[PDB]
Structure 1
């Protein structure tokens, strides 16, 4: 996160850190708890990931230093990538992790509500991007989960900012015209959380951008509302 500040423990209890074990253990991507055995994240995070056996999901984490070999985690039973996904820049940048065991909800780990189909017409004015990602293009993973409040940008305005790309309605953009606050390397797959009527909703999934927090380059997010039926298809399978 560029231009963000330290989160307070328990502030974003749906935020997870997805680690890879191969070749060595490290943070890979962000994710959000959406159900007791479900993590919603970005499809691009799994480039070259050949098995869910190398993945570890850590919930209830503020600082990466809380993670040692004796720290409990959730194993991943299955990686579900949207079957239309080719690359982040073309959309369908969404994946589900089905956990081997059930998350016990509490003040440190709980789910974020998915947006409602009716909420496609609501205007979100209180949106935040969170993660352990870089504070600039050449940096390192941060110990403390960072947060940054970012304004949502219309599809028309985002398309003007990305000439040569096709910004679809399955993407949602966020950023200040002057830059300064955005997601960066290591934040992808994490949430873009918006508060509306005292309830937080998972509005976006950190996906892609041209550099980090650059002037007139909003961050591009998977527009979660456009995938509610796909999420329910995969999570509510009979």
Structure 2
């Protein structure tokens, strides 16, 4: 996260850190708890992942340094990537992880609601992006989970900034015209979380952008409301 600040314990309890363990253990991507056995993340995260065997899902983590050899994690039973996914910038950047067992929800690990039916024309004004990613283009994975408030951009404006890509209704863009706050390397797969009527909704999945927090280049997120039918089909 560029231009963000440290979170505190319990602040974003649907945020998980997805680790790979091949050839060594490290944070790979963010993700969001959406059901007791379900994580929503980005399809692009699984480039070069040979199988679910090498993945570990950690919930309730504030600092990456908390994770030791006896820290409990969830195994991944299945990775479900959208059948039309080809590359992040072309869309369909969405994946479900089915966990090997059910999360018992606690103060530190909680689900986030999907965008609610009948809310498609809501204007979200309280949106946040979170993650352990770089604070600048050439940086390093951060120890403490970071947060930044970022405004949504219309798809018309976003397309004008990305005339070499097809910005579709299944994408949502977020960023300041002057730059300065954005997702960056290591944040992808995590949530764009928006609060509406004091309820948090998973509005976006952190996906791609031109650089990090550059002027007039918003971050691009998978527009989760356009995938609710797909999510419900797979989780049922």
Moved over 4 A (4+): none
RMSD, aligned CA: 0.4
The residue number in structure 1 matching 2:212 is 212
TM-score by length of 2: 0.99
Cα deviation, residue 118, structure 1: 1.4
Residue of structure 2 equivalent to 1:115: 115
Alpha-carbon distance between aligned partners in 2 of 1:86 and 1:11, rounded to the nearest angstrom: 34
TM-score when normalising by structure 1 = 0.99
SS in structure 2 at match of 1:226: helix
Question: Residue 117 of structure 1: CA displacement?
Answer: 3.1
Superposed displacement of residue 130, structure 1: 0.0
In the aligned structure 1, how far is the partner of 2:192 from the partner of 2:10? Answer: 16
Q: Post-superposition shift, 1:71?
A: 0.4
In the alignment, the residues of structure 2 paired with residue 6 and residue 173 of structure 1 have an alpha-carbon distance, to the nearest angstrom, of 23
User: What's the CA shift string for 1:170-191, capped at 9, x where partnerless?
Assistant: 0000000000000000000000
1:161-219 residue CA offsets vs partner (Å, 9 max, x unmatched): 10111100000000000000000000000000000001000000000000000000000
Q: Report Cα offsets for 1:134-170 as digits up to 9, x if no partner.
A: 0001000000000000000000000011011110000
Q: Which moved more, 1:110-119 or 1:23-32?
A: 110-119
| Secondary structure in 2 matching 1:74 | coil
Q: Determine the C-alpha separation between the residues in 1 that align with 2:58 and 2:223.
A: 24
**Structure 2 residue 142 is the aligned partner of structure 1 residue 157:** no
Unaligned runs of 5+ in 1: none
CA distance in 1, matches of 2:208, 2:137: 13
Structure 2: give runs of 5+ residues left out of the alignment.
none
Which residue in the other structure is 2:88 paired with?
Answer: 88
Give how far 1:24 is off.
0.2
- Identify the residue that residue 132 of structure 2 maps to in structure 1: 132
Aligned length: 236
Q: Distance in 2 between matches of 1:166 and 1:108?
A: 38
Paired residue secondary structure (1:24): coil
- 1:13-71 alpha-carbon deviations (Å, 9 max, x no partner): 00000000000000000000000000000000000111000000000000001101110
Distance 1:160 1:180 in 2: 19
